Design a protein around this ligand. Structure first.
Ligand SMILES: O=c1[nH]c2cc(C(F)(F)F)c(N3CCOCC3)cc2n(CP(=O)(O)O)c1=O
Ligand SMILES: O=c1[nH]c2cc(C(F)(F)F)c(N3CCOCC3)cc2n(CP(=O)(O)O)c1=O
Lengths: 61, 130, 169, 32, 173, 51
C-alpha cells in the first residue's frame, strides 16, 4: 500500500510506448565523417599521383 | 573533377549517372582508375549502409504498426498508465468503486483518488469535454 | 570565353556573400523555454528582443571532440577563409594569366573548401539534437552555386588545356 | 560457420583450379 | 550491429579472396590485374565485367553468396536493434563498483553507514572504503535530498549508497 | 546479357522468383532476431501470474 499503491510510479508495468522517434542523426554523423575522410584521402592520393606522373613526364620528356 | 583530371566518364552527365548508379545498388560504365574506384567504394558502401538502415527502420515501424490492440478491459487499464480514466464526482458509481473488494478495482479507485489533477467531472457533458 | 569567366567570378562572389550571410545571423531557429533565432554565434528570443551568446559548449571522448568541433563553428569559418583564398586566387588568375596551372590548383582548393563547408554543415546539423533558419538554406544554395562554379572552372581549364595541346602540336 | 563453409568452398575451388591448370600444362607440354 | 571484431575478419577474408582471384586470373599462361581483381572483389562484396576462367568464378560466386548472407544478416540484426530498443543497466551487483573506476559512488558524510564501511573486514568493502576515503573531489553529501539531487545531476556518472527502504521509496516517487 | 525472347522470359520468371525467396529469407531472419531480443525470463511472482 504505502510504497507501490501510494507511490506515483507505474514502473515495470507499461514497457514499450512504441518509441515514436524516426531516426536521429547521431547514427549518421560518424558515417558522414568517414565519408568526408574517404573523399579527402582520395583527393590527396589523386593529387600526389598526378603530381608524380607529371614529374615523371617532365623528367622523361 | 578527378575523371577529367587524369575517358568514358568525361562528361558531367556520365559522372552524375555513375554517381546515381553508385547511390543505388545496381548499375553501367565501369571506371578504370585507382582514385575513381576508391571514391566509388567509399560512397557506395556508405549509401548501402544507409539504405540498409532505411529498410531496417521501415521494418521496425511496420512492426510497431502491428503491435498490441487498444484497451478492451479493466485489466488493460491496470496494465497501463498513459491513458487516464475517471468517473463522475458524485453517485453510486463512486460508491461501487470505493467499496469494491477486487484489488484491481481497488488500485483503480486508489489511482483515481490520488490523481493529479482530479479525474472527476461534475456533469456528463463535462466528461464529454474531458 | 570571357563570359564564362565573368559568370564564374560573379558565382564565387555570390557564394562568398551567401557564406557571409550564413556566418552573420538567422542560421537556425528553436523554441526556448516562444521561438528564438540563432546564427551559430548568439541567440535572440522572440524578454522579447534580448540577445545573448547562447553557444555554450559545456553545460565518450568522441562526444567531447564533437563538442569542441561544434564550439564556435570552426569548420565553416575555415571553409569561408578557404573560399576567400580561392576567390583571391581566381581574381589573381583572371587578370594576367601567366601560369597555366594556378587555375587548376585554385579550383581544387575551391572544391575542397566546398567539401569542408559541407562537412561543417553536417557538424552543425549533428549538434542540433522546431524549425530551421533561412541562412542554412542560403549556405546550402551557396554550396550548390560553388559546386556549379567548380564544374564551370574545371570545364574552362580543360578547354584551355585542349587549346594548349592543339596549339602545341 | 559461414566462414567455415566459405573457406571450404575456397579451398575446394583452389585445388580444382590447381589440378586443371596442371592438367592443361601437361597437355600443352605433351602436344605442343 | 552484428559485430565488434568480425568486420576485421570480413576485411581479411576480402584480401584473401582477392589474392586467390589474382592467383587464378593471372597465372593461366583480360580480367587480370591485382587492382582489377581487388575492385571486382569490391564489386562482389556490395551489389554492382566478369572473368571467364571458369575456375575462379566459383570463388567469386561463393564470395558473392557469402556477402549476400552478410548483408541479409546485417539488415536482420539492425532491424532487431531498431525493433525492441531494450535499454540495459551497466551496473548490476555490488562488485560492479569495484570492477570499474569511471562512475563514482558515495555515502553520507556522517552516520552509521560510514561506521559500517569503515570497520569492515571484507577486502572488497575495504577497497570501497579506500576509494571513498581518498576520493577526488569529496563524494560525501550534506543531506539525503542533496545526495538525490547529486545523483540526478550526475547523468550516469555518480551513485549514492543508503538503506533499501528509502531507496525503494524514492524510486516510487 | 542474353538477347533472345525465350531466354529473357526464363530469366524474368526465375529471377523475380528467387528475389521473392531471398526477400522472404531476409524477413524471416529479421523475425527470428526480433524473437531473440524478446522478453526476459521470469523475475517475480507477477511474471509467474502472467504466464
Ligand atoms: O437511481 C439512479 N438512477 C440513475 C439512472 C441514470 C440513467 F442511466 F440515466 F437512467 C443515471 N445516469 C447515468 C449517467 O449519466 C447521468 C444519468 C444516474 C442514476 N443515478 C445516479 P448514480 O448514483 O450515479 O447511479 C441514480 O442514483
Ligand atoms: O537510528 C537511526 N535511524 C535512522 C533511520 C532512517 C530511516 F530510514 F529514515 F528510518 C535514516 N535515514 C535513512 C535514509 O533516509 C534518511 C534517513 C537514518 C537513521 N539513522 C541515521 P544513520 O546512523 O546514518 O543510519 C539513525 O542513526
Amino acid at each position: 500500500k504505502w510504497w507501490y499503491d501510494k507511490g506515483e510510479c507505474g514502473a515495470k508495468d507499461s514497457g514499450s510506448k512504441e518509441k515514436t522517434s524516426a531516426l536521429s542523426l547521431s547514427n549518421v554523423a560518424g558515417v558522414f565523417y568517414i565519408l568526408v575522410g574517404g573523399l579527402g584521402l582520395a583527393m590527396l592520393v589523386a593529387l600526389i599521383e598526378f603530381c608524380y606522373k607529371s614529374r615523371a613526364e617532365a623528367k622523361r620528356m | 573533377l578527378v575523371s577529367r583530371f587524369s575517358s568514358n566518364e568525361f562528361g558531367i552527365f556520365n559522372s552524375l549517372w555513375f554517381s546515381l548508379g553508385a547511390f543505388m545498388q545496381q548499375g553501367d560504365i565501369s571506371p578504370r582508375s585507382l582514385s575513381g574506384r576508391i571514391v566509388g567504394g567509399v560512397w557506395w558502401f556508405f549509401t548501402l549502409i544507409i539504405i540498409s538502415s532505411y529498410t531496417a527502420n521501415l521494418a521496425a515501424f511496420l512492426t510497431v504498426e502491428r503491435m498490441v490492440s487498444p484497451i478492451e478491459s479493466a485489466e488493460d487499464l491496470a496494465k497501463q498508465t498513459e491513458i487516464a480514466y475517471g468517473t463522475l464526482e458524485a453517485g453510486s458509481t463512486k460508491e461501487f468503486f470505493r467499496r469494491s473488494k477486487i484489488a484491481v478495482f481497488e488500485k483503480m479507485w486508489t489511482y483515481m483518488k490520488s490523481a493529479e489533477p482530479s479525474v472527476f467531472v461534475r456533469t456528463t457533458e463535462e466528461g464529454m469535454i474531458r | 570565353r570571357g563570359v564564362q569567366m565573368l559568370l564564374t567570378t560573379v558565382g564565387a562572389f555570390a557564394a562568398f556573400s551567401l557564406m557571409t550571410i550564413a556566418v552573420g545571423t538567422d542560421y537556425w531557429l528553436y523554441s526556448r523555454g516562444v521561438m528564438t533565432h540563432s546564427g551559430l554565434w548568439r541567440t535572440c528570443c522572440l524578454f522579447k528582443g534580448l540577445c545573448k551568446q547562447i553557444d555554450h559548449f559545456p553545460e565518450d571522448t568522441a562526444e567531447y571532440f564533437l563538442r569542441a568541433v561544434r564550439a564556435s563553428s570552426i569548420f565553416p569559418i575555415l571553409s569561408v577563409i578557404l573560399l576567400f583564398m580561392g576567390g583571391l586566387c581566381i581574381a589573381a588568375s583572371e587578370f594576367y594569366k601567366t601560369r597555366h596551372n594556378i587555375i587548376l590548383s585554385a579550383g581544387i582548393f575551391f572544391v575542397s573548401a566546398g567539401l569542408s563547408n559541407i562537412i561543417g554543415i553536417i557538424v552543425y546539423i549533428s549538434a542540433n539534437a522546431y524549425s530551421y533558419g533561412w541562412s542554412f538554406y542560403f549556405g546550402a544554395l551557396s554550396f550548390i552555386i560553388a559546386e556549379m562554379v567548380g564544374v564551370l572552372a574545371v570545364h574552362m581549364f580543360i578547354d584551355r588545356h585542349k587549346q594548349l595541346r592543339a596549339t602545341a602540336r | 560457420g559461414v566462414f567455415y563453409i566459405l573457406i571450404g568452398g575456397l579451398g575446394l575451388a583452389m585445388l580444382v583450379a590447381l589440378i586443371e591448370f596442371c592438367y592443361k600444362s601437361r597437355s600443352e607440354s605433351k602436344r605442343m | 550491429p552484428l559485430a565488434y571484431e568480425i568486420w576485421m575478419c570480413i576485411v581479411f577474408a576480402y584480401i584473401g579472396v582477392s589474392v586467390v582471384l589474382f592467383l587464378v586470373s593471372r597465372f593461366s599462361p583480360n580480367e587480370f590485374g591485382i587492382f582489377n581483381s581487388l575492385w571486382f572483389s569490391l564489386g562482389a562484396f556490395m551489389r554492382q565485367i566478369s572473368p571467364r576462367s571458369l575456375s575462379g568464378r566459383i570463388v567469386g560466386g561463393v564470395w558473392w553468396f557469402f556477402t549476400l548472407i552478410i548483408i541479409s544478416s546485417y539488415t536482420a540484426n539492425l532491424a532487431a536493434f531498431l525493433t525492441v530498443e531494450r535499454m540495459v543497466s551497466p551496473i548490476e551487483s555490488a562488485e560492479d563498483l569495484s570492477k570499474q573506476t569511471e562512475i563514482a559512488y558515495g555515502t553520507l558524510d556522517s552516520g552509521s553507514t560510514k561506521e559500517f564501511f569503515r570497520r569492515s573486514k571484507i577486502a572488497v568493502f575495504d577497497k570501497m572504503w579506500t576509494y571513498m576515503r581518498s576520493a577526488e573531489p569529496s563524494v560525501f553529501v550534506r543531506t539525503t535530498a542533496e545526495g538525490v539531487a547529486r545523483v540526478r545531476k550526475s547523468k550516469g556518472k555518480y551513485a549514492y549508497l543508503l538503506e533499501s527502504t528509502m531507496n525503494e521509496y524514492i524510486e516510487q516517487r
